[PDB]
Every structure is written in structure tokens, then in C-alpha cells.
Write a protein that binds this ligand. Structure first.
Ligand SMILES: [Zn+2]
Lengths: 64, 90, 76, 89, 35, 88, 76, 74
DNA sequence: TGCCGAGGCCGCTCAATTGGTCGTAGACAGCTCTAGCACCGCTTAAACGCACGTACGCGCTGTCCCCCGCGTTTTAACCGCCAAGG
DNA sequence: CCTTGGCGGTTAAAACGCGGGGGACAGCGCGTACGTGCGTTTAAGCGGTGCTAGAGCTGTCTACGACCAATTGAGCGGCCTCGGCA
């Protein structure tokens, strides 16, 4: 079953903190970051061990 | 006969003929393809469904006329392909 | 998907319209006519929502989108 | 002026809407009386038929099904509602 | 949801009700605005 | 907005027959639509003649344009026999 | 009269429309469609002229009457 | 233009007399009416043609015109 | 026999009345445009008959794909169970 | 001892195969009234001055209704009194 989790991470674009939601689909190995504010979306691959800090880390490197 | 029966019935009533949940899913899917996670008032979706069903029903009236014009009792693709063309939809 | 517009819902609508016997190649067409109608109305409803700086498509945005097609809708 | 003109709609509220709609820069002295008279006629022609059909059918109140059956029948005003759809929801 | 209408009005206001959670000495309520 | 007067005309045309709560919203959207259509059309008329004041004559012409046939005739007779009763 | 809408002028219109063969009863049916179209457009052109306090139906009154039917006409 | 322009003008003045009296027409007004009328009739004939062909009829009949006009909402 | 339903009185908020600007709307004059309405010369376009042909329509046939009913069965969507933690 | 992570159990109906049996799609036959290209003759159609004036175009003048500013009256909601049905 998918996991819809709220986090305390700051969006890299709109800068609103505590407004990034992480949807981790392990059945297809696809993780999804969403803002609740500006609502920018970012997709990245996840394994079985990943957690909201794993894809949010991949989002920091995808920008820089 | 049962076909006629249904036509006597549906034309008598005004309830929505498409299932609510499914329609909600279709609308949200299509909308999601324009702008991500768009929230919807329930009345917005209801408006969309009323409009869509009225549209399809009218289309089926015209389609029926096109089929009957061709001395047929069964509506086919050439009917809609005609009704919508004359409507200026295509 | 568009497959949620099932075979007997298109048949029911046809029954309301006055159709007696309906050929098989009409549901896909209807699914393709309904998708064009929704792609024409939802585009204007999303345009009114993005113009109103909202994120929730209200029912008056749908009434305005149907009004821009000559399909005024009373009751919202 | 509504009772003085022996009408039922307020010339005032509609006039206020005209000011808020900003349909022009300045209205006339008798333009809202004519518009309220004309509007009043259309409401007293549609609801006259809805009240005629509720007692012809035998209904007590007026439902939206009565409005949808009347305005698309009654070729008197069925032309005004060629492109309308009463929601019925 | 607190129903405005009986399941006829019951005195309700129609509002959906939140899921109230305790966080120390503070109570947080999460309302589901009207998938 | 206009729902308080729809029931007031309904008390004159049918003092025994009541109206629902959805039908009041339908008649209120009907009235706000034929209002924002007649005033809109009238506004177009006042621009085509380069005037600045919407008089009753631009309303009589927007009624002749919008309503088809006998509804426009009756519509223009009720507005005229309400403005004349107003000025007297 | 409506009889000025001659048989070969309707025949020319039909040819311009792509019709190969014309029945012998189209001719009175096309005059009855043209008369309805003119009774719908000239009524609005005369309404704009009586509103403009004129006695001469100009071409912009005809453009406005065709605009009120979704038939915008460029070139006047 | 495929209709004798003058005949379109006559008919026009006749119909117009039934709405408002002692009317005068700019020549451009009549011309506008004729362009509009002929464009309308041509389009109608296209749709009628489509109806006839639909009913194994490429040759328009009154029935075809009536179907076309009904679907147009005329 | 007596208290909640309805009308009346005291506040609230928005509508109605009055006075000064103020540029834009209405008047009015000078004057040229294309619409005014009457006649020529010529011509592209129109009124009416033909006739063998291609299209329009009626009747019979094939086989054939939607017609009506039943049964579980599955997504989607509402209500209760495994056995880990804090 | 109590409340979430994923999982059976919880319905209205359709995911319809597929058994049965017939309405009706498209090609094929015959079959008749109507039907346009070409032919005649025409009555109106296109282009030119000649004449005559209606009212648009553009100019400055004079002008009356709205804007935003201080007064202030009527409709409506919250207290508060009066009254007959149960
Ligand atoms: Zn963001």
C-alpha cells in the first residue's frame, strides 16, 4: 500500500517549511515529492529501504 | 420491447445516469493532466456531470435522428460522425 | 480512464435519448465525444480558477465554462 | 416606487446591481422601472406556468422537475430555453 | 460529519468534523475541507 | 439576491401554490442571467450609438433583440405600461 | 415576392455546396429557409435602425444582426 | 454572388416592410444581406449533401435539409 | 391553566437626499462622401422544354452482431480483524 | 492495555462469457420519376457620366448628471411583552 507522509522539509523553490509531502510507491519503486504550497512536483526512484529523507536528498542534488 | 420500456422510464426521470465515483475519478484525472493536484468543490464536479450528461443525451437524440434518416433503427459511428459534424463540433 | 463510462451507462443515456437498438461502435465514439466535451469545458473551468488565483474548481467556474459554449446551467 | 408603479420587484435593488455591474456611467430616470417591469413579466410568466402545471399535474409545491418540464415545453417560452439545462440536482 | 439534517433538521451546522490529536499540552484538529 | 421577490410575485400569481428551495435558486439564477443579459446587450447598444446613459429606450431595444417574438412584444408592453404608470 | 429566388439560382447555390443532383421540391423548401433567415436577420437590423432613430438600414446594422446569430461578417 | 442581386433586394424590401414601414436601404446593407444569405444557403447545402450521402443520398432532398436544420438547432 | 409563537420596541447597517466640481455628452456649423434615384448600351445571367442516365427507393436474402436473462465475480468503496510497540 | 502499518470481510452492480433466438447492415435486382448540359431567347446585370442633396467627419461651445463628502430615514435582527390551544 502507498505511503502518504508529511515531512518537515523546506521546499527548494517556494521556501515554505513543513509543506513537502512524500508519496512512496514501493510496488513500482517510484517516489513522489509534492509541495502543499507552490505544489511543485518531483519524481525519483526509491528502493525498499528508502524514507522521505532519501528522496528529499535526491531532490537537492537534482537542482544543483 | 425492454429497450422501449427503458426509454419510457429514463425519459420520465432526471437522475444522473453515470456513476458518481467513476465520474469523479475521470474528471480529476483529466484535470490532473492540466494542473497537478487541483482541488475540487463537490458542486464543481456535480456541475461537470450535469453538463456532460445533458450533452451526451442531446448528442444521442441527434445521432438517433441520423440513424433513422438512413432507414436504420440502430445507432452507429456514422451517425455521431454526422451529428457532430453538422453541429460544428468537427 | 475513459473506460469508466461503461457500456450500460452509454446505453442508458441512449435510452433517455430515444435510441431503440444500438450498434457496438458508438460507446467508443461517445467516449471520444464525451472526452472532447470535457476537454473543452474543463479547460475553461481551469482557466477561470487560475484567473481567480484558486486551486479548487468551484461550480461557478463550471457554470461560466458552460456559459461560454451556449449551455447555460441553472441551479448553482 | 414599486407599489407606486404597482409592481412586485424593487426598482432599487436592481438599480444597485446596475451600479455595481457598471454597465454604463449613468442610468436614466425610468430605465430601471422598465427593466424591473420587464423582468417581473418574465417571472410572472414562468411561475404562472409552473403554478398552472403543479395544479394540472396535482403537485403541491414547485420542484425543479416542474421547471424543466415547463420551460422546454410551452413553445411560448421554449425558444428562450433552447440552450439551457436545469440541473435537477 | 456533523449533519445539518437528520439521517428534518437536528440543529446541526453541516460542518465536517476534525480528527483531534493531542501534542503535549496542545490539541490539534485536522479538518477535511471538501478526492 | 432576487429570491425574496420571486416568492412575492408567486404570492400574486399563485397564492396557494408554494415553491421548493432548489427551484428558488433556479429562478434566482434565471433572473440574474436575464438581468445580466439585458443590461449587457443594452450596454452594447449604448456603445454602438456612442451614448453614455442607459435610458429605457436601450432597455426596450435590448428586450426586442433578446426575447424572440411574442415574449418581446409582451415584454415591451409591460415595461411601457409600467413606465407610464410610474411617471403619472 | 419570394419567387425571385429562381430555380437556377438555388441550383447554383447547391452546386456551390457540392450537391450533384437536386430533387424537384428543394426549390420551394430553400425559399422557405431563406425567408426564415431573412425574417430573423432583418428583424434585428430594423430593430437597430429604429433604435438609432434612423430610416435607412445601414450595413453595420446588418453586421450587428448577423453578429447576434454567430455569423460575424468582415468587410463593412 | 449566385442570386440576381436585385431579386435579393426586392424580397428584402418586401420582408422588411412587414417589420417597419417607409424604410430605406443602403446598397451596402442589401449587399451584406445577400452575402450572408448566400453563404448560409451554401453551408446548409453542404450539410444537406452530407445527410443525403449518409442515406445513400448524395443528392439533397427536403428531408435532408430538414434533418440538417434540426441538428443545427434551426 | 400557562408557556413558547407572534407581533412590537431598541439597536445596525446600508440606502436615500443635497451640495460643488468636471470633463464628457449634447448642439451646432462648415463641408465633402458615397448613397441618392433616373436613363443608355451592352451583356452575363435567367425562364422553359429534352431526354436517355445516374441516382433514389422498394423488396428479398445472408448471416450476424447486439437483444434479454443469470450468475457469480471484481473494482471501488464502506466496516472489523493479525499480532508487534510504546 | 491501546492504535496504527497492511489484510480479509463488508455491498450495487457490471467486468459479461455464452445459451438462446431474431432485428436489421450492406450488397444485390429491378424499376420507375425525375434531372442537368446543352440549346433558344430573353430581361435583367455591369459599368459612365449627369444631377441632386442626407447626414457623416471633424472642429470648438455650452452644458447637465455622476464622484466622492457630510446628513439621516426605513428594513431587519435581537430583546421583550401579549395571548389563546393543549
Ligand atoms: Zn514548493
Amino acid at each position: 500500500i502507498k505511503q502518504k507522509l508529511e515531512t518537515q522539509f523546506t521546499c527548494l523553490f517556494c521556501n515554505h517549511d513543513n509543506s513537502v509531502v512524500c508519496t512512496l510507491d514501493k510496488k513500482n519503486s517510484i517516489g513522489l515529492l509534492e509541495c502543499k504550497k507552490c505544489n511543485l512536483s518531483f519524481q525519483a526512484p526509491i528502493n525498499s529501504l528508502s524514507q522521505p529523507i532519501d528522496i528529499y536528498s535526491d531532490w537537492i542534488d537534482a537542482c544543483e | 420491447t425492454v429497450a422501449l420500456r427503458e426509454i419510457r422510464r429514463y425519459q420520465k426521470s432526471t437522475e444522473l445516469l453515470i456513476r458518481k465515483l467513476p465520474f469523479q475519478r475521470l474528471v480529476r484525472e483529466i484535470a490532473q493532466d492540466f494542473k497537478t493536484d487541483l482541488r475540487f468543490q463537490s458542486a464543481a464536479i456535480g456541475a461537470l456531470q450535469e453538463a456532460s450528461e445533458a450533452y451526451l443525451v442531446g448528442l444521442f437524440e441527434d445521432t438517433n435522428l441520423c440513424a433513422i434518416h438512413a432507414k436504420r433503427v440502430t445507432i452507429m459511428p456514422k451517425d455521431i460522425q454526422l451529428a457532430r459534424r453538422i453541429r460544428g463540433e468537427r | 480512464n475513459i473506460q469508466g463510462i461503461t457500456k450500460p451507462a452509454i446505453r442508458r443515456l441512449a435510452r433517455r435519448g430515444g435510441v431503440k437498438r444500438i450498434s457496438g461502435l458508438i460507446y467508443e465514439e461517445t467516449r471520444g465525444v464525451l472526452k472532447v466535451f470535457l476537454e473543452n469545458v474543463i479547460r475553461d473551468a481551469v482557466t477561470y480558477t487560475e484567473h481567480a488565483k484558486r486551486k479548487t474548481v468551484t461550480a461557478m467556474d463550471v457554470v461560466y465554462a458552460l456559459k461560454r459554449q451556449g449551455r447555460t446551467l441553472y441551479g448553482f | 416606487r414599486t407599489v407606486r408603479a404597482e409592481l412586485s420587484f424593487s426598482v432599487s435593488q436592481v438599480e444597485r446591481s446596475l451600479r455595481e455591474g457598471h454597465y454604463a456611467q449613468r442610468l436614466s430616470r425610468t430605465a430601471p422601472v422598465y427593466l424591473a417591469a420587464v423582468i417581473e413579466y418574465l417571472t410572472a410568466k414562468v411561475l404562472e406556468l409552473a403554478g398552472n402545471e403543479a395544479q394540472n399535474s396535482g403537485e403541491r409545491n414547485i420542484t425543479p422537475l416542474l421547471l424543466d418540464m415547463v420551460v422546454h415545453n410551452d413553445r411560448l417560452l421554449s425558444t428562450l430555453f433552447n440552450t439551457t439545462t436545469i440541473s435537477q440536482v | 460529519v456533523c449533519e445539518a439534517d437528520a439521517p428534518v433538521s437536528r440543529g446541526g451546522c453541516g460542518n465536517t468534523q476534525p480528527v483531534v490529536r493531542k501534542d503535549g499540552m496542545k490539541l490539534w484538529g485536522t479538518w477535511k475541507k471538501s478526492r | 439576491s432576487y429570491s425574496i421577490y420571486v416568492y412575492k410575485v408567486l404570492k400574486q400569481v399563485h397564492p396557494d401554490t408554494g415553491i421548493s428551495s432548489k427551484a428558488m435558486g433556479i429562478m434566482n439564477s434565471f433572473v440574474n442571467d436575464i438581468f445580466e443579459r439585458i443590461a449587457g446587450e443594452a450596454s452594447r447598444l449604448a456603445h454602438y450609438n456612442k451614448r453614455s446613459t442607459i435610458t429605457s429606450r436601450e432597455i426596450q431595444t435590448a428586450v426586442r433583440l433578446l426575447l424572440p417574438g411574442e415574449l418581446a412584444k409582451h415584454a415591451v408592453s409591460e415595461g411601457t405600461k409600467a413606465v407610464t404608470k410610474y411617471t403619472s
